[PDB]
Structures are given as C-alpha cells and as structure tokens.
C-alpha cells in the first residue's frame, strides 16, 4: 500500500497556506541528510563514481549531485 | 441533510375551511418538492408536483406555493374525501425523505 | 474600513472616464478602489461555497480480516480451488507452497494453496465531485466614510445598513449590483468559471475532515475502491495493496491488514488546501477571480453637506498600515446634522497647503448625537506629516512622517505586483484594469508562455523546480550564443523566483 | 393504461428474504425509473431505493446496504425487489412507482422530473409482515 | 453580436407559460457572454469556450 503520490507534485501555486508546506518545504533535505548520515561511505562511493563520468571538473560534482540524489528517496 | 419537518402534525376542521400545511427542509430545495395525500389503505392522492404545479385530474381545491425552504399547501374548502394523511417529500441530492404527516378530521 | 489591518490589500484606481475596474477579487485579501468621484469602496471576498457535490468513487484506509483459508493442494492435481475465493468480499491470492512427504500427497515437491480471508474495512474516504456549475462565491464590501469601527462585528445589520453590502454570485448569475442607497449601485460582473480551475478537483472528506483534491492525484492512490457505488456491501477494488500475504521460509501462508494509513493519507496529503462546513453546503477558503467592476451609479450623498465647525478630537493614536497609509477615528459633539468634515495634510499651515492622498473622501457624519467617532484614513507623502482635521483654529493637527520614501513605494509595489505574478499568473494582468492595448498584450503573452510553461513544467515541486533553477543557472552561464543562454537564465530565474513563493 | 400491479402480502422469517414482484402495463416497460418506498403501518414513508427496468441499473439508501437488491425481468415487463436479512422493523408495507425521464440508466435528478414524478402506478402496496 | 450563431431565427410557438425553447450557439476562444432575452430584464450567461 504505497501511498504513491505526494500531492505536491500537484502543487496549487495559490495564495492561500496550502495543506503541510511547513515541514515540507525541509523534509527532502532532511530526507537526503539523513540518510547520506546513516550511509556515509556512500559519500565516496559516489565520489569515485562521478570522478569517471562527465570528464569535465564542471560535470563532475553534476554526477555527484546525480548518485546522491538517487540514493535516499528511491532506495 | 435532507431533514423536512412538515407542521403541523395534525389537524381538524368543518368543511369549505381552508387549511394550510407548511414544511421547510434544512437544504436548498428550490423546486424539488412534491405533495400527496393518502387515506389508510390506499394509494395516496394526486395533489402536487414541483410545489407549485397542479396535475390534470386535481380539483382546483388545492394549491401549492413557497419558493427557497419552506413551503406552504391550501385546500381552499375542505370536503369530506380531503381525510386523509398529507405527505410532503423532497426530490433532490437522493436520500429521498418525506414528512411524517399532517393528519385531517372532519368536525 | 474592512480591509485595513488586513495586508495583502491592495488600492487600484481607474483613468477616470467609462469605469472599467475589472479587480482580481481576492479571497485571502482586500482591495479598495478610488476614484475623484464615486466614493472610494472596498472589496473582501469572504467565503466561497459549493451547493452540489457527487459521490465519486470512495476509499478505504481501515480494514480488517477474518475467517481465514488456505486450500492446500498436492504438488500435482491442479492448483487450489478454495470455494470461499467464490465470493469477493473475500481477498485472495494464489501462492505455490512447497510439499513434502509426510504431508499427505504422495508425490511431493512445490504444491499450491490459496490462502486467503475475508476484507471488511472502516473509515470510508468519501472523495465527491464538484463541478464550476452550483458552486457559489460570497463576497461582502464596504463603502467609506460613516460607520465608526466598520469591523465585520456585527455584519448583520451592516448590509441592511448602507456603508456595507453582501453579494452572491453564481455561474448562472454573474451580475450583481450592490446597491446602496444613498451610495451608488456598485455594478459587478465576474468569472465563476476561471477561479479555482475547477472540474479538475474534488472534494474529500475523510474523517469528516474535508479538502479540495486536484482529481489526478485522488484517481492515483491506490486503495481499495467503492469506485462508484452506492448502497449494497461495498465491493471493493483492487483489493491488495491494504492486505498482505506472507508465508513461512516453504509454508502456512497467513495475512496481515496493515491496520489503518489515515495518518499515511494525511502526510500523502501536502499539497491539498482544506476546506469546512459541509452539510449540503461545502464551504472553503481562499480562491480568487476575476470582476469587472463598473461605476456606473455611485452619488457621493452630501457633496453639498456643510463644514460643521465643531472642534474635532482624535481617540486612537492613528498608527499606519504596511501600505503607508494610516486611519485615524475621530470624535466629536458640538454640532449637528449629516456633516461633511474636512480632512487634509501639509507640511506647513498658515497654507494647510492640502497634499498627500486622500483616501477616505467626502467623510460623513450621521447625526446630532455627541462625540460620534467619524472612522477613516488618509495616506502621507514620506517625509513628516502634518494631518490637519477640524476647520480653522479650534481645528485639530497632527504630526505623522510617513518614514516611506517614493523609491520604497516603487519598490513595495513591484515586489507586491511580482508576487500577483506568480500566484495569479495570468490572471495577475488586468488587476489595474483599463482595457489597453499592451494590457491584453501580457494576458495574451502569459496566456501561451505560462500555459506551455504548466503543460512542459507539470506541477514543479519546492526541491525539483529549486534544482532546476540552480542548473539552468549554471548553464546559462556556460553555453555560447547568448540567445539562447540567455534564455536558460530566463527560465532559471522564472524557476528560482517561483521558489521565492508564499512559503516564505 | 399506466398502472402497476405488486404482489400480494406476505409474511417471512426474521432474518429471511422477500421478494415482492410489481408488473407494469399500459407503457414501455423501458422508459420509467422503479423507485421503491416503504411505509411502517403507522409511519410515514421513505424512499428505500430505485431500479431501471433497463440495463437492471440500482440504487438505494445506508437504510438498506446489504439487504436489498433490485433486478430487472424485460420480457414480462416486471421488477423483483429482495429484502435479504430480515428485521422486526421491515413488517410495513411498500410501494414500486414508475418515474420521470428514464432515458439510460440511473435516478438522474438534476434534470426536470414531475408529471408523475412517481405517482401515476403506485399500484396497491405489498403489505410484508416479519414474525414466526 | 459576435460568434457562431447555429439555431438561426429561434421561433416560439404559443402563449402558454414556460416553453422551454431549445436551441445552441457557439462561443469564440476565449470568455464568453451568452445573452439571450432582450435588453434589460434579459438574462446573460458566461461561457468562455476553451478551445
Ligand atoms: C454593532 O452593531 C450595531 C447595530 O446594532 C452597529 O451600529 C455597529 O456599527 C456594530 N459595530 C461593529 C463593530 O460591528
């Protein structure tokens, strides 16, 4: 029962509060943080892996921003 | 949500009297009402639809009226086959309730 | 009056000459109108509500299982039959289990068994439909001038009252003119239609606590579904992802409900806006639209009326608004009659050198009665402020200073106005409304661009539209030929400002 | 001519299931919602639910989830009402009418409803009674 | 007066109280201001086609 879809996807850009934005617009960075805190090795996994891809010193922390980003929320 | 009280809950009076009921529903039902009578025993009489509107057959003796919730039914002369339990009941949203009843009585 | 202490108010004026005042009506703030005639009004729009809502499909977050089976087979004579699997107000699934010797069936190897249970359930989420048609705004306005402490109080009496009025609108009647009399007829004509983006939304309530759903999202969760239906055991749909089957390491498969996700559908909620009353009434909050506002009848009633010379006494300390300007109650006996009362401002008298906006016009006063408290409000240039009230000597004058200088309006109101062109995007056109050439020129070109922008930018997130934003800034400044590069930085800072939202 | 005819009182285990018949004549059978009404002996009445004699399309009210169910017979032109798991309040008396615009299948109210919304064949009412 | 006007020359037929004459139109793409009765107690309607 995968309650798939975060509504905010759907977002309604009106002026009124919408419904939990509070904690919402922190909870993917503490998602990210968290886990990359119970998964640190992780940091250089991904480092040398984007350090192989793009070739372009500019690219590089692209790639990084890459597998850190895949890792936490689809895992 | 589809509360209907229909007052009084019973009446009596001579004949040639007018009489009146009134019923007014919690909702917005702005032209979804209809009225019948029913002796005991029987299949109830055409009196109204849309809560203005007589049906070909109904003597001219009763009318209907009332526009936004609450609504009012008249005989103009009450006559001897009028003893009966009036019923008013709403048509829309569909949980479909009707009155409890306005009973008459010939004095 | 109404819509002061209420920020994210607005003031829009009209080239004098046909009244073409078509306002953004907000329902999360106020706008006042001014004109040189035809007394300065307001508009606030108080609640919006739905008359007719269908009963689409529901759902069910709380199950609960029983009488469970399991239907073992060899490992050949078919696979398991499970007569209860016959009815669905049983869930059921299929599952190939290992069997051995001394477990019957001579043979052995990987049988099946059914294993399965009854799927009562709890705590339906009645989701209903809404449709643009027998939905019904309600906005109340006020007038200026009279009605010491306005303050929706006792709104009551105030639209049988003059300085106050209170109009339905339905997409069946756009037109409403707010009639006051003595006051004018306030001619209003609006969209019912292009609000809220309806027939995309629908109204949920769960735990009769209710909110609007944009319709993808409520078709895309996966619960069980009463998927249309009316009375009769609920068969519900789809029927597994709530149970759960497990068996041991080979065998004895059982099942689990997974208990309740209202919680689960709550924090699934984030992006839905919550929503009241209901009955056969559904009343929300905000939601804005768009109002042709004609002033074609407003009298001024007492442009004639005398200058009563009663000295004039301030009561409350006339504090200003985040929009500069600053309302003052002034009292005072001594005269009678319906009076007109001067207000003005200066920087020096002996001149009284009248300067400064001028909000509340033509102030009235009712009555004989003593010291009646004459509300209203005047806005100051942004240096020091002389706010001059009664006549002449036994008038009665105040310092102000503003402290907000022309460069800082220009600035509140490009940051306010950039706010409106986010939130309302298109529809953050015509607020100052006059039908120019350029002004249907930006609808249009917000139009297209802005629509392309949703259907190619589906519904960007905080975090995703944020990173966007980020790396089409890091592009816009890589690639050659600005033309285009130039437009990643167009898009990036589109992103980026979108991300500088309400939120904050 | 327009008329509908149930059929005739009954008496049934508490916890059984009635079904009570109501015959139509004088119009196409396909053209009238089948609304069903019931009516304790000294209660009012209250709609208990409604059919479409075409496609067997139904519906009712939470008074009823579960029990009732209404099916459709084209050829000699009836509907059959079940009450499943009967209950010491369904000893009443109820009523099958013909209604309105049935044009597909459904109630279908938002539209114009009336002459007759559902009075022309009330018929004579099934009177049930649930003892032993 | 501007649009697709489908149901030329719309006719009413007799006294009696409210026929229900049917008939259609069709809107440009944009907002829209159906009116129908005469002048002042008409009746006007919004539309805005869509398309
Ligand atoms: C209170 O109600 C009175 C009428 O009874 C009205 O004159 C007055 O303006 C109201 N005050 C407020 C603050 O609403």
């Keep these: ?75 | 949500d589809i509360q209907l009280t229909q007052s009084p809950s019973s009446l009596s009076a001579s004949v040639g009297d007018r009489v009146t009921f009134t019923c007014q529903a919690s909702q917005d039902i702005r032209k979804y009402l209809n009225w019948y009578q029913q002796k005991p025993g029987k299949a109830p009489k055409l009196l109204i639809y849309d809560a203005s509107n007589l049906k070909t057959g109904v003597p001219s003796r009763f009318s209907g009226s009332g526009s936004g919730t609450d609504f009012t039914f008249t005989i103009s002369s009450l006559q001897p086959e009028d003893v009966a339990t009036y019923y008013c009941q709403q048509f829309d949203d569909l949980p479909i309730t009707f009155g409890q009843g306005t009973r008459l009585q010939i004095k | 009056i109404r819509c002061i202490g209420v920020s994210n108010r607005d003031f829009v004026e009209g080239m004098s000459g046909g009244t073409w005042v078509d306002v953004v009506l907000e329902h999360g703030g106020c706008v006042t109108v001014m004109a040189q005639d035809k007394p300065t009004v307001d508009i606030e729009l108080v609640t919006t509500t739905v008359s007719n809502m269908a009963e689409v499909r529901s759902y069910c977050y709380e199950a609960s299982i029983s009488d469970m089976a399991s239907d073992s087979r060899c490992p050949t004579q078919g696979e398991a039959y499970l007569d209860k699997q016959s009815d669905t107000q049983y869930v059921c699934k299929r599952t190939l289990v290992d069997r051995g010797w001394g477990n019957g069936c001579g043979l052995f190897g990987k049988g099946s068994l059914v294993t399965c249970a009854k799927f009562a359930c709890s705590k339906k989420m009645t989701g209903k439909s809404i449709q643009p048609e027998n939905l019904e705004y309600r906005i109340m306005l006020s007038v200026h001038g009279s009605q010491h402490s306005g303050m929706i109080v006792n709104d009551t009496g105030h639209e049988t009252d003059e300085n106050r009025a209170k109009v339905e609108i339905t997409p069946n009647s756009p037109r409403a003119e707010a009639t006051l009399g003595g006051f004018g007829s306030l001619g209003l004509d609006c969209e019912p239609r292009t609000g809220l983006d309806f027939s995309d939304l629908y109204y949920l309530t769960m735990n009769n606590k209710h909110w609007l759903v944009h319709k993808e999202w409520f078709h895309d969760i996966p619960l069980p579904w009463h998927a249309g239906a009316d009375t009769g055991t609920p068969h519900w749909n789809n029927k597994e992802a709530l149970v759960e089957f497990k068996d041991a390491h080979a065998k004895r498969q059982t099942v689990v409900v997974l208990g309740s996700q209202e919680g689960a559908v709550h924090t699934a909620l984030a992006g839905a806006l919550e929503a009241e009353m209901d009955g056969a009434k559904g009343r929300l909050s905000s939601g804005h639209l768009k109002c042709r506002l004609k002033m074609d009848k407003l009298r001024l009633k007492g442009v004639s009326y005398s200058l009563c010379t009663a000295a004039f006494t301030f009561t409350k300390i006339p504090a200003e608004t985040l929009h500069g300007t600053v309302t003052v109650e002034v009292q005072y006996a001594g005269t009678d009659g319906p009076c007109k009362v001067p207000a003005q401002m200066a920087v020096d008298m002996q001149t009284l050198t009248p300067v400064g906006r001028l909000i509340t016009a033509n102030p009235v006063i009712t009555e004989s009665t003593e010291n009646s408290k004459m509300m209203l409000e005047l806005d100051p240039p942004f240096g020091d402020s002389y706010i001059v009230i009664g006549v002449g000597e036994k008038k009665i004058t105040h310092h102000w200073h503003r402290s907000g200088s022309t460069i800082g309006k220009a600035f509140e109101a490009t940051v306010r106005g950039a706010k409106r062109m986010a939130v309302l995007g298109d529809t953050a056109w015509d607020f100052g409304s006059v039908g120019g050439a350029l002004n249907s020129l930006g609808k249009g070109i917000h139009q297209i661009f802005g629509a392309a922008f949703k259907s190619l930018f589906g519904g960007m997130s905080w975090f995703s539209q944020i990173l966007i934003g980020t790396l089409l800034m890091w592009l816009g400044l890589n690639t050659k030929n600005g033309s285009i590069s130039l437009m990643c930085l167009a898009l990036g800072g589109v992103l980026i400002f979108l991300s500088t939202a309400v939120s904050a | 001519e327009v008329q509908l005819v149930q059929s005739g009182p009954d008496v049934e285990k508490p916890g059984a299931s009635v079904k009570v018949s109501c015959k139509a004549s004088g119009y196409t059978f396909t053209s009238n919602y089948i609304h069903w009404v019931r009516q304790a002996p000294g209660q009012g009445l209250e709609w208990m639910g409604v059919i479409n004699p075409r496609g067997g399309s139904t519906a009712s009210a939470q008074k009823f989830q579960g029990r009732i169910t209404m099916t459709r017979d084209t050829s000699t032109s009836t509907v059959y009402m079940e009450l499943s798991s009967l209950r010491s309040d369904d000893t009443a008396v109820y009523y099958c009418a013909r209604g309105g615009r049935a044009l597909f299948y459904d109630s279908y109210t938002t539209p114009r409803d009336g002459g007759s919304w559902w009075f022309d064949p009330w018929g004579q009412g099934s009177l049930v009674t649930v003892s032993s």
């Excluded at chain 1, 503490?30 to 500019?58: K, M």
């Design chain 1, 1 to 75: 029962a995968v309650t798939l879809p975060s509504h905010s996807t759907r977002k309604l850009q009106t002026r009124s509060q919408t419904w939990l934005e509070s904690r919402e617009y922190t909870k993917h960075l503490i998602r990210v943080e968290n886990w990359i805190f119970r998964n640190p090795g992780f940091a250089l996994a991904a480092a040398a892996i984007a350090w192989l891809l793009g070739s372009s010193t500019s690219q590089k922390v692209i790639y990084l921003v890459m597998i850190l980003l895949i890792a936490p929320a689809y895992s």
